Amino acid sequence: APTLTARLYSLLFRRTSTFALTIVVGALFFERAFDQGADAIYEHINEGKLWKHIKHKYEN
Amino acid sequence: RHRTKKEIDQEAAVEVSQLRDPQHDLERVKKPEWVILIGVCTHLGCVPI
Amino acid sequence: DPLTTVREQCEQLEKCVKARERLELCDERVSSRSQTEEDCTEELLDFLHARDHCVAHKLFNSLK
Amino acid sequence: SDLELHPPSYPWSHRGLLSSLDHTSIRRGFQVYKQVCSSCHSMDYVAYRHLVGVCYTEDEAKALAEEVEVQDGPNEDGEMFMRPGKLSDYFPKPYPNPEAARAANNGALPPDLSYIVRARHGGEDYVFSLLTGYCEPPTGVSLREGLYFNPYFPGQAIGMAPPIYNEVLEFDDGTPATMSQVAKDVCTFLRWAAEPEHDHRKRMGLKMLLMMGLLLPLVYAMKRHKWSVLKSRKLAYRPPK
Amino acid sequence: TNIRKSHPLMKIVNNAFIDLPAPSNISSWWNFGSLLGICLILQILTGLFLAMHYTSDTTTAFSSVTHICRDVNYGWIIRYMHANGASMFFICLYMHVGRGLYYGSYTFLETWNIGVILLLTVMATAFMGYVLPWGQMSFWGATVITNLLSAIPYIGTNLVEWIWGGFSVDKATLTRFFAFHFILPFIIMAIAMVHLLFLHETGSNNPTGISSDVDKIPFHPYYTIKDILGALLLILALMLLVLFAPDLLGDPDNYTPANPLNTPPHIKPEWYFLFAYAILRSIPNKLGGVLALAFSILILALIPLLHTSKQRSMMFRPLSQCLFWALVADLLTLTWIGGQPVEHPYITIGQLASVLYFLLILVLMPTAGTIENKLLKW
Amino acid sequence: IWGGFSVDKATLTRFFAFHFILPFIIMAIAMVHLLFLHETGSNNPTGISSDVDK
Amino acid sequence: TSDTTTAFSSVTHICRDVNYGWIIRYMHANGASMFFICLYMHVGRGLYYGSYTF
Amino acid sequence: GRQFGHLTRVRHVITYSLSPFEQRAFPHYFSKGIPNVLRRTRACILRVAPPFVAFYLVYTWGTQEFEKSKRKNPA
Amino acid sequence: SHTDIKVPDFSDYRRPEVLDSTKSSKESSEARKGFSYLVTATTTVGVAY
Ligand code: HEM
Ligand code: HEM
Ligand code: HEM
Ligand code: HEM
Ligand SMILES: C[C@@]1(c2ccc(F)cc2F)OC(=O)N(Nc2ccccc2)C1=O
Ligand code: FES
């Protein structure tokens, strides 16, 4: 009943210290989530990569 | 470049006065069947076909 | 070999027919005299241009 | 001579902006390189380790290198011996010189095939059209017959005989080895030989566009925020009397 | 007192990038200066990382470039960032010069005249770099450009053989070119600082060509954030080139190793040299052509003396606007003719475009300014 | 910094590139050195202020 | 040139074959030593004369 | 080097400004924006466009002519 | 006479939270600074990536 922007400001954005801490924690979690999605999008587009490699491995 | 008689006749027949760089064919070759050249254009140094 | 299937089907199409005939009327022209310079390169290249265009649209559905 | 015909646009599995190479089609196309082309064509910039990522296993590519003898630099006598073949070694060379290439092929030099896609206008389309486009000469046109008719080659007289209707190759998965399909696989492989980065380039490419789709509106919103002070400013002129 | 204001080093940063009075009204077209600076640092960084792996012998130059692109981790992006960065550099150079022309920014005599030097220096830089991978276009491009000097009466042959280190482009030439190509962007960086010094005497011109002392804003935050946005648009355009079309502006003959015995049938410059190339081959004379080519770039140093209008900018000048856009389209035409064979329609139209280039600048634009003055009773 | 398991091919070429760039960086730091100096001017043998005799 | 196969040879090439390559090479090698002689005299001056107070 | 306080003399001008936190970054962005770009296009078209069309016409003629020059019909 | 200086209407340009003249702006300053700083935060994350 106060806003989420208001809470994100009050708790995190007011101090430049916590603002910087938010971005760096933000960047680590973003790098994981962005790479995981952007691989999976590229993977779904393509399907002749080493999707095939069940054929030739495990025989070894 | 080994030269046919038709070519040697043709280069004798060229007007020396009408040229950019005025030479007779006879002053250019030691013996008229054999023309030997550096294969580099005098403009900007490309190799002529 | 499915290139043969596709080229036969391409030759059916209307632009190729008119280019085959323009080549045919060059074939007939160049036989006809003892000394000529004329070539029929221009007439053949004209035809394969129309033919390989249609080839490119279709061929790769066959190939596995 | 003088007149030219230009290649059509074939719809490769790798044409479109986010479209990777077919690596099964890379696998078959190496086999075309090994069987057919390598007897006349150098590929000086691909080694057996390059295949390991791409189209074979580590064990497979070791075994393929094992098929050829190399020459290694000397032991204690100062010698040069021949060697069973490794992974570090490059694809094997048909000729010691360019002149030896010319001597075998009646004056014509078969060019290196590492960059041949990137070294011709049309890329793979030109190579495909060269391979699948061998025909009879038209009337007016006689050759040496040391030279051969191709409408896609400039000048029309190529020193390469058709290497292609010959129905070759051990096939493993075992697809039909038609003239069309053998040319499709070799061109897919020759793209890879020219451009191993192709697949990484495009994955990065997607990642760029997605990031730029975020970052461009956001930086724009930042510049709009700061510039607001100015873009909504009001002036009044109030001179005396 | 602030630290920012009176610290002897931070002083310079303050007066250049923070507290610098800037026109409120400078457009998009003023982004290209910072973008040229970005382009220079991009060429520096990628170039150093290429220099870490490139070797400058004829036997190994092509192979070392190949080694970068297959074997060196991410050598391909660095290589292509560099090649396409050079193109970005020329795109930004041309937009920047064109801004100067249209807006009368050339009235800053010293700033402009240094910009000309900057242009001739990046041109020499990018020429010598293109030689380095020792492809076919590298070699014959090296051959054609170096031979332009042989047209100079009496001393010309001695001058070219001196810069070759021999009787043609060879071993001595390539290594030379690596050394000169390394040094020149650091010289550029120093001349770019001198350029910026001369500019700060006056500050910026603006779209209107009217003095903006009445309406200056601080450079920060306004043009710091505007320049950031500009840089991210440069990164988009560069990355589109590297990650989607890396060979689009490259000649395929440069993927074939240098052959000293055989030319390509075509022979064409990179896109940014095509107007000047069209101007050279328009003249059926050796010396005439090169003199025309030299004069096509060096004319920019005469543009200050041919200003004739009582207004600085072309904003309030419809006649000059039509003639300016006629120049741009003439330059587009010249870039088209540059990239085509020396054959039937292309020769005579290439001659006509070459005449018109020199007609627009030397005659037509200074006549438009005078007519426009007379029209305004000035 | 090797680019490998010892000083090798990667090391030498690296070192050529770094050796070329660094004296231009030196030249820039030498200008900054001279800037800081001109705030005070030179010291002298006596270590006493020489404003009286410049 | 900066390859392991050719680095020694190119330096040799400077000293025999390149016109006055020997003076340039030796001016460079000994210039480096001159640089360090001047560096050390300069630092030592700073130490003795209290120039480090800047 | 020019500095604030030393630029020029201005008398009798009031500027009113709002905080960026008080106000919109994109105020009437399409509804006022696209009328403005349309007005800007109209203002400049007659100066910009006619040289480029004249290039395009010389481009399309020149390419067509050259293509058609590289053909015979009698010998 | 300086008393004739009213500040002109900024209703066109104002955020919807601050249009009401009878409402405290304090009630929305947290939300409004929140929004603009989230923009700069999201950007720095993206640029860091
Ligand atoms: C195997 C299917 C194969 C391919 C693929 C191929 C490619 C190829 C290209 C792209 C050219 C270049 C043409 C050009 O200059 O634009 C070319 C040239 C020659 N080749 Fe080849 N080649 C294939 C295999 C073979 C084989 C098996 C031989 C020997 C019968 C052969 C020989 C040649 C020769 C000779 C040339 C030079 C032609 C010329 O310029 O006159 N190739 N190859
Ligand atoms: C090495 C490439 C160059 C760099 C790094 C560069 C640097 C810049 C910078 C930072 C600006 C200020 C911002 C702006 O107006 O863009 C600028 C302005 C200027 N530049 Fe350049 N410049 C270069 C090339 C040139 C060239 C080739 C010329 C034209 C011969 C040019 C002439 C000028 C002029 C006249 C201005 C004043 C513009 C005005 O205020 O309207 N510069 N330069
Ligand atoms: C001092 C920083 C620079 C260094 C150390 C440097 C070094 C290099 C090296 C090693 C190469 C050869 C490798 C290659 O071709 O990919 C190269 C090529 C190149 N350089 Fe630079 N460079 C610098 C800046 C410049 C600048 C300012 C320009 C002009 C915009 C430039 C234009 C290019 C071009 C066009 C090539 C050819 C790229 C290609 O097509 O392969 N570089 N340079
Ligand atoms: C790149 C090599 C250097 C250059 C080009 C250089 C440049 C110079 C110049 C031109 C002077 C003024 C004339 C003079 O007093 O000698 C000077 C003074 C000074 N230098 Fe350097 N310097 C360098 C190395 C150093 C080093 C290594 C130090 C010590 C860590 C040093 C510390 C100083 C100090 C303290 C002075 C003030 C001297 C005084 O007035 O008594 N410099 N520098
Ligand atoms: C990149 C290039 C170039 C850059 C800047 C310049 F001012 C002139 C140039 F030729 O260097 C080069 O060798 N070519 N290529 C070329 C030059 C003359 C004839 C044909 C090709 C260029 O376009
Ligand atoms: S005509 Fe220009 S190099 Fe031959």
DSSP state of D98: H
The total of other beta-carbon atoms located within 10 Å of residue E167's CB is 10
**Alpha-carbon gap, residue B31 to B35, rounded angstroms:** 8
- Does H contact E via 3+ CB–CB distances below 8 Å? yes
**Alpha-carbon gap, residue A38 to A41, rounded angstroms:** 5
**Which candidate, E16, E41, E19, E24, places its Cα nearest to that of E199?**
E16
The total of other beta-carbon atoms located within 10 Å of residue C11's CB is 15
Domain of I5: which CATH number?
1.20.5.270
* Residue A20: alpha-carbon gap to chain centroid: 18
In contact, D127 and D160? CB cutoff 8 Å = no
The total of other beta-carbon atoms located within 10 Å of residue A12's CB is 19
Q: Which token pair is E109? A: 């005599």
Residue D236, CB-side half-sphere exposure with 13 Å CA sphere: 10
CA-to-CA separations, B29 to B3, B8, C56, I39, in angstroms, rounded: 11, 11, 56, 82
**Alpha-carbon gap, residue E77 to E206, rounded angstroms:** 37
Q: Whose CA is nearest to atom 1 of ligand 6?
A: B43
Contacts C42 to H, Cβ<8 Å? 71-72
> In chain G, what's the furthest Cα-to-Cα distance?
51
What was the resolution (in A) of this experimentally determined structure?
2.3
**Which candidate, E284, E22, E273, E300, places its Cα nearest to that of E141?**
E273
**CB of D159 closer than 6 A to ligand 1?**
yes
**Which candidate, D10, D7, D8, D6, places its Cα nearest to that of D181?**
D10
The residues in H 23-52 lying below 8 A from D, measured between CB atoms, are 23-27
Domain of H65: which CATH number?
1.20.5.210
**Alpha-carbon gap, residue D131 to A30, rounded angstroms:** 48
Rg, chain A, Cα only = 21
* Structural domains present in chain D: 1-196 (1.10.760.10), 197-241 (1.20.5.100)
The catalytic position among E11, E171, E200, E266 is E200
- What is the DSSP pairing of strand E216-218 with strand E21-23? antiparallel
**Alpha-carbon gap, residue E188 to E125, rounded angstroms:** 9
Angle at A45 between CA D60 and CA A28, to 5 degrees: 90
Residue E178 makes CB contacts below 8 A (sequence gap 6+) with E54, E56, E132
**Alpha-carbon gap, residue E102 to E369, rounded angstroms:** 12
CA-to-CA separations, E249 to E25, E29, E88, E121, in angstroms, rounded: 35, 24, 11, 22
**Which candidate, D185, D194, D175, D149, places its Cα nearest to that of D36?**
D185
Q: Whose CA is nearest to atom 3 of ligand 5?
A: E127
**Which candidate, D80, D112, D79, places its Cα nearest to that of D94?**
D112
In contact, B41 and B48? CB cutoff 8 Å = yes
**Alpha-carbon gap, residue E110 to E90, rounded angstroms:** 22
Taking an 8 Å cut-off on Cβ atoms, the answer to whether I14 and H23 are in contact is yes
Q: Which token pair is E182? A: 């390394």
Q: Provide the number of structural domains found in chain H.
A: 1
Of E236, E244, E256, the CB nearest to D119: E256
The total of other beta-carbon atoms located within 10 Å of residue E171's CB is 15
Domain of C25: which CATH number?
1.10.287.20
Name the method of structure determination.
X-ray
**Alpha-carbon gap, residue D38 to D91, rounded angstroms:** 8
Taking an 8 Å cut-off on Cβ atoms, the answer to whether B47 and E262 are in contact is yes
CATH fold for the domain made of A1-60:
1.20.5
**Alpha-carbon gap, residue D229 to E145, rounded angstroms:** 53
**Cα torsion E109, E111, E117, E122: sign:** negative
From the alpha carbon of E64, which atom of ligand 3 is closest?
13
Q: Would you say G13 is a known binding-site residue?
A: no
**Which candidate, I36, C20, A37, places its Cα nearest to that of D138?**
C20
Which residue ranges of D make up the annotated binding site for heme c? Answer: 37, 40-41, 160
Give the burial string for E216-255 (b: 16+ CB within 10 Å, else e): bbebebbbebbbbbbbbbbbbebbbbbbbebbeebbbbbb
Residue C27, CB-side half-sphere exposure with 13 Å CA sphere: 9
- DSSP run (H or E) holding D234: strand D234-237
Is E227 assigned a catalytic role? Answer: yes
Q: Provide the number of structural domains found in chain C.
A: 1
**Which candidate, H38, E361, H21, B23, places its Cα nearest to that of D229?**
H21
Rg, chain G, Cα only = 18
Per-position DSSP letters for E270-325, written without gaps between them = -GGGHHHHHHHHTSSSHHHHHHHHHHHHHGGGTGGGG---SSSSSTT-HHHHHHHH
- Report CA dihedral (E281, E286, E292, E295) to the nearest 10 degrees: 130
Residue H7 makes CB contacts below 8 A (sequence gap 6+) with E21, E213, E216
**Alpha-carbon gap, residue E334 to E273, rounded angstroms:** 10
The total of other beta-carbon atoms located within 10 Å of residue E158's CB is 11
**Alpha-carbon gap, residue D91 to D47, rounded angstroms:** 6
Contacts C57 to D, Cβ<8 Å? 11
CATH fold for the domain made of E1-378:
Cytochrome Bc1 Complex; Chain C (1.20.810)
Burial (Cβ within 10 Å: 0-12, 13-18, ≥19) of residue E103: buried
Q: Provide the number of structural domains found in chain I.
A: 1
How far does residue B44's CA lie from ligand 6's centre (Å)?
A: 5
**Which candidate, D111, D114, D162, D155, places its Cα nearest to that of D136?**
D162
Interface test with E, best of B44, B46, B47, B49 (most E CBs within 10 A): B44
**Alpha-carbon gap, residue E56 to E170, rounded angstroms:** 11
Tell whether omega for the bond before F23 is within 30 degrees of 0, i.e. cis.
no
